[PDB]
């Protein structure tokens, strides 16, 4: 019970981190385009990122 409960928690935590860093990476990559007046997000960038 202890191993399964802890392992499940840790695995879920790792997934939460993987997702958390993905949205941070997206925020960091996209912000400079949204922060720039008159800028248009490149199709490829807007294709891969949800923007």
């Amino acid at each position: 019970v202890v191993v399964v409960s802890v392992a499940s928690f840790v695995l879920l935590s790792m997934v939460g981190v993987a997702v958390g860093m993905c949205m941070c990476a997206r925020r960091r990559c996209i912000t400079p385009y949204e922060l720039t007046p008159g800028a248009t997000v490149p199709f490829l960038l807007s294709l891969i990122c949800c923007i």
Partner: protein, 151 residues
């Protein structure tokens, strides 16, 4: 003149916000809120990397905004407290031309187009280099002189 708004904190103006192109620009280092309720209620995206906050202009009610360019040829540019010299890729003004609280003020070219936003500056003899926000194709960059202080 044009499209510049005050940013107030407590009982004083701490800086300015402006409408450039399709987006509202305000320096992230400035405390307080925008005087115009229409912009004050607008959500902004903050990036500490550029000391800059931006939000989309509510053009449905405020389509009037300054024109902008990515072109920054060596020469002179205008702003509210005087003229600024662009030399060596750097913006330079007289030391008494700028001051704390003038942050957020735009720099215009001779066509009336916005090229940069003033954040601060550094004193080099009788002249001071400016810390500014500038942009090129699809990217915004921050240029900060060594020892420059936020205004």
């Amino acid at each position: 003149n044009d499209c510049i708004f005050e940013v107030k904190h407590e009982g004083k103006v701490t800086g300015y916000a402006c409408l450039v192109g399709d987006k509202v620009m305000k320096p992230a280092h400035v405390k307080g809120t925008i005087d115009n309720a229409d912009l004050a209620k607008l959500a902004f995206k903050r990036s500490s990397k550029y000391d800059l906050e931006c939000a989309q202009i509510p053009v449905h009610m405020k389509s009037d905004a300054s024109k902008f360019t990515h072109e920054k040829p060596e020469g002179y540019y205008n702003w509210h407290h005087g003229a600024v010299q662009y030399s060596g890729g750097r913006f330079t003004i007289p030391t008494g031309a700028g001051k704390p609280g003038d942050s957020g003020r735009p720099i215009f070219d001779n066509k009336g187009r916005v090229v940069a936003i003033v954040l601060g500056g550094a004193n080099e003899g009788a002249r001071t280099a400016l810390s500014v926000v500038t942009w090129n194709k699809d990217i915004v960059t921050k240029i900060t002189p060594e020892g420059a202080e936020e205004w």
